[PDB]
Amino acid sequence: SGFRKMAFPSGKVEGCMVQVTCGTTTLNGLWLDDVVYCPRHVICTSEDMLNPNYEDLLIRKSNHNFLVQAGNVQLRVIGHSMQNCVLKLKVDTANPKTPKYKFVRIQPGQTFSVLACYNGSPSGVYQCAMRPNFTIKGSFLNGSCGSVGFNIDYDCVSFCYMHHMELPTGVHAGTDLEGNFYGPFVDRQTAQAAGTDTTITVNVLAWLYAAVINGDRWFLNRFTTTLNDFNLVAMKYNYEPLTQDHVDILGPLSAQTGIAVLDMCASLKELLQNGMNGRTILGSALLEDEFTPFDVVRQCSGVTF
Amino acid sequence: SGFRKMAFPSGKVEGCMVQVTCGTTTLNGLWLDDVVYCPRHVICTSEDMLNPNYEDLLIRKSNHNFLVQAGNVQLRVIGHSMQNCVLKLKVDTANPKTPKYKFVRIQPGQTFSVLACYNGSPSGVYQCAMRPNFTIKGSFLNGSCGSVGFNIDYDCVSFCYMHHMELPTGVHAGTDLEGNFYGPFVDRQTAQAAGTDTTITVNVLAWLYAAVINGDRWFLNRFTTTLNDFNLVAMKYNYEPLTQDHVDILGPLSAQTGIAVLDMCASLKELLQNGMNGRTILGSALLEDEFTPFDVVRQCSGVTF
Ligand SMILES: C=C1CCN(C(=O)Cn2nnc3ccccc32)CC1
Ligand SMILES: C=C1CCN(C(=O)Cn2nnc3ccccc32)CC1
Numbered sequence: 001s002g003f004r005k006m007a008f009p010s011g012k013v014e015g016c017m018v019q020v021t022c023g024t025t026t027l028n029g030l031w032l033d034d035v036v037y038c039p040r041h042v043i044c045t046s047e048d049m050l051n052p053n054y055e056d057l058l059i060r061k062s063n064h065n066f067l068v069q070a071g072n073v074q075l076r077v078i079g080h081s082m083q084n085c086v087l088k089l090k091v092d093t094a095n096p097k098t099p100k101y102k103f104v105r106i107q108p109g110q111t112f113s114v115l116a117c118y119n120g121s122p123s124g125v126y127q128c129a130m131r132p133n134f135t136i137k138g139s140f141l142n143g144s145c146g147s148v149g150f151n152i153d154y155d156c157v158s159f160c161y162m163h164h165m166e167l168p169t170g171v172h173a174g175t176d177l178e179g180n181f182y183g184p185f186v187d188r189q190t191a192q193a194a195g196t197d198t199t200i201t202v203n204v205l206a207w208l209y210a211a212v213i214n215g216d217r218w219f220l221n222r223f224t225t226t227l228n229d230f231n232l233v234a235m236k237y238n239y240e241p242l243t244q245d246h247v248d249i250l251g252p253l254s255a256q257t258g259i260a261v262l263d264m265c266a267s268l269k270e271l272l273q274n275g276m277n278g279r280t281i282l283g284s285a286l287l288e289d290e291f292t293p294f295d296v297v298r299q300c301s302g303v304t305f
Numbered sequence: 306s307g308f309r310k311m312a313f314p315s316g317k318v319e320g321c322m323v324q325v326t327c328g329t330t331t332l333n334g335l336w337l338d339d340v341v342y343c344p345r346h347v348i349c350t351s352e353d354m355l356n357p358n359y360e361d362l363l364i365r366k367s368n369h370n371f372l373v374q375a376g377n378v379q380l381r382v383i384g385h386s387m388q389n390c391v392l393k394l395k396v397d398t399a400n401p402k403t404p405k406y407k408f409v410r411i412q413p414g415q416t417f418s419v420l421a422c423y424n425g426s427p428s429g430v431y432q433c434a435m436r437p438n439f440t441i442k443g444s445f446l447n448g449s450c451g452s453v454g455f456n457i458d459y460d461c462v463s464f465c466y467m468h469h470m471e472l473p474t475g476v477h478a479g480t481d482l483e484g485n486f487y488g489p490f491v492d493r494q495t496a497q498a499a500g501t502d503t504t505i506t507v508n509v510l511a512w513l514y515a516a517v518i519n520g521d522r523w524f525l526n527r528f529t530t531t532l533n534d535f536n537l538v539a540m541k542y543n544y545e546p547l548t549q550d551h552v553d554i555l556g557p558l559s560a561q562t563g564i565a566v567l568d569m570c571a572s573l574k575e576l577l578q579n580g581m582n583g584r585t586i587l588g589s590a591l592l593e594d595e596f597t598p599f600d601v602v603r604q605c606s607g608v609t610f
Binding site: 001002003004005006007008009010011012014015115116117118119121122123124125126128137138139140141143144166170171172214215275278280283284285286299300301302303304305 | 444448
C-alpha cells in the first residue's frame with residue numbers, strides 16, 4: 001500500500017538521448033532507428049527569437065552543420081528535414097538501443113513521464129499531466145529543450161511530448177513528435193495566451209478512489225448526487241464537466257471499492273464546497289488531478305514493463 | 306523554471322534488477338558484479354512469518370534452491386551467505402550492466418529514488434525521504450520486496466535502501482545493502498513501534514528557497530528570528546531542531562536568493578503559526594519536507610549524470 005506520484009522507469013528513453021548542436025545552440029535530441037528528432041529552434045540565434053523565419057534559417061544549414069553526439073560517439077548526418085516544429089536528422093547508424101516505440105498525440109488530462117535532460121544527458125524523471133489548456137507544469141531550465149515525455153505499455157514506449165518553450169508565465173509548452181504544438185502556441189519568444197485552465201475532474205475522482213484503497217476514508221459521506229447537479233458544482237469551481245465516458249472509465253475503481261461513481265462525486269462536491277478543514281488525503285492538502293484512472297489501477301495492481 | 310518531485314533516471318538500476326525465487330516465494334534481487342543481493346525472507350513460508358528462525362531456514366537450502374532469473378537468462382548460483390537481513394547469492398557470471406556503484410547508509414532526512422519492481426521487472430520510479438523515525442512512506446505492493454533506493458552522483462550509483470516490510474500502519478521499512486535495518490525494525494510479521502516522527506526542518510527551508518527562486522514569494526515577511534526562538538517554535542510543531550550545520554548547508558540557497566537563513570526561518574515560523582490561509586506554494590498546500598538543500602540546488606542548476 002501507499003500512493004506516490006510515480007514515473008515510468010526511464011531506462012529505455014535514456015538510451016535514446018543525444019546532444020544536438022547547430023552553431024552556438026545546444027539542445028537534446030531523440031535518436032530512434034536512424035533518425036534524430038529535436039526542436040527546430042536549434043537553428044536560431046538570439047536576434048532570431050522574437051519571430052524566426054525557420055525556412056530561411058534552415059536553408060542556410062547543411063548536414064555537416066548539425067553536430068550530433070551520443071555520449072562520446074559522434075553521429076554522421078546524412079539528411080535533414082523540417083516537419084512542423086521539429087527537425088528530423090537522418091544519421092548513418094541506427095541506434096542500437098532503440099526500444100519498441102510509437103509516436104502518440106495525447107489528449108488533455110492524460111499523464112506522462114518526462115525525462116529532463118541537458119546536453120544529451122539525463123538529469124531526472126517526473127510524472128506530470130497535460131493541462132486542459134495544453135500546457136504542462138514542468139521543471140525545465142535553459143538547455144532542456146528536446147527532452148521528451150512518454151508512457152510505457154509492456155515493452156513499448158509511446159513518445160507523446162517534446163519540450164520546446166517556457167512561456168513568460170513560467171508554464172511549459174511543447175509538441176508531439178511530428179512537431180505539432182499542443183495548444184495555440186508557436187516557437188517564438190513572445191507572450192502567448194494559454195487561456196483558461198481547469199481541474200481534471202475524472203483524475204481527482206480517480207485519486208479519491210486511490211485514497212480509499214489506501215485507507216484515507218474520512219471524506220466519504222452519507223450523500224449522493226446526479227451528474228447534472230455535480231456538473232453545476234464543477235462549473236462553479238472551474239472543474240472539467242464529468243461525462244458518462246468518464247463515469248465508465250472509473251468503473252473498475254468503483255467496482256474495487258464498492259463506492260458508486262456518483263457517491264464519490266458527492267464526496268468531491270462536499271470537499272469543493274467545504275474544503276479539507278485542515279486535513280490531508282494521501283499526503284496532500286489539495287485535490288490532486290495528476291493521476292488518471294488508468295494510473296491508479298496500474299499503481300494499485302503492480303503492472304510492470 | 307518550475308519545481309517537481311524529481312527522481313534520478315533509473316536506467317542504471319533497471320539493468321541490475323533480477324527475480325529471485327526460493328520455494329514458493331518470489332521477490333526482487335540486485336545483481337552487481339557476480340553477487341545478487343535480496344531480502345533474506347525469500348526463504349520463509351507463511352507458517353514462518355511471525356518469528357522466522359532464519360539460520361535454521363537457511364540451513365535447509367542449497368545453492369540450487371535459489372532460482373535467479375534476469376529477464377529470460379537463468380543465473381547459476383555458486384554460493385550463498387546471509388549477512389544481517391540480506392542474502393548474498395554468488396553467481397558464476399558478472400552482470401555486464403553493472404554500473405559504477407557504492408553502498409551507502411544514509412541519514413534520516415536524506416532523500417533517494419526508489420525503483421519499484423515486481424518479479425524482477427521495473428514498475429515505476431519515485432523520490433522519497435527517509436523519515437526521522439527511519440520509516441519511508443512508499444508505494445509498495447506484495448512482491449516489491451528487494452526493490453532498492455539509490456542516489457546518483459556523476460556516473461556512480463549509491464545504493465542506500467532495500468525494501469523489506471510494510472508495517473501494519475502502512476508505512477515501509479527496509480535495510481541498507483549490508484542488510485541492517487534502518488530503525489528499530491525486524492523482519493517479522495508483527496506490530497512494531499516506529500515512534501515519534503517529526504518534520505525535516507532543513508528540507509522545508511530548502512523548499513521555501515526553491516519557491517522563491519521560482520517566484521512564489523507571498524510568504525516572505527518583514528520579520529527575522531533567532532535560532533533559539535525558532536527552535537522553540539519547531540518543538541511546538543514537531544519539527545526537527547535546526548542546528549548551525551543545517552544553517553551552513555543552506556548557505557548556497559541563502560546566497561543565491563539574498564534571504565538570510567534566519568529571515569527564512571521567520572517566514573517558516575509565521576507559516577507554522579498561521580497556516581497557509583488557503584494559498585499554495587509550488588503547487589502544495591502543506592509544507593513540503595522531501596527536498597534536501599542539495600536536491601534544490603541540483604534541480605535548480607540542471608546537474609546531469
Ligand atoms: C523560440 C523559442 C521560444 C523561447 N524558448 C524557450 O523558452 C526555451 N526554453 N524552454 N524551456 C525553458 C526553460 C528556461 C529557459 C528557456 C527555456 C526557445 C525557443
Ligand atoms: C517477514 C516479513 C515481514 C512482513 N513482510 C512484508 O511486509 C512484505 N511486504 N513489504 N512490503 C509490502 C507491501 C504489501 C504487502 C506486503 C509487503 C514480509 C517480510
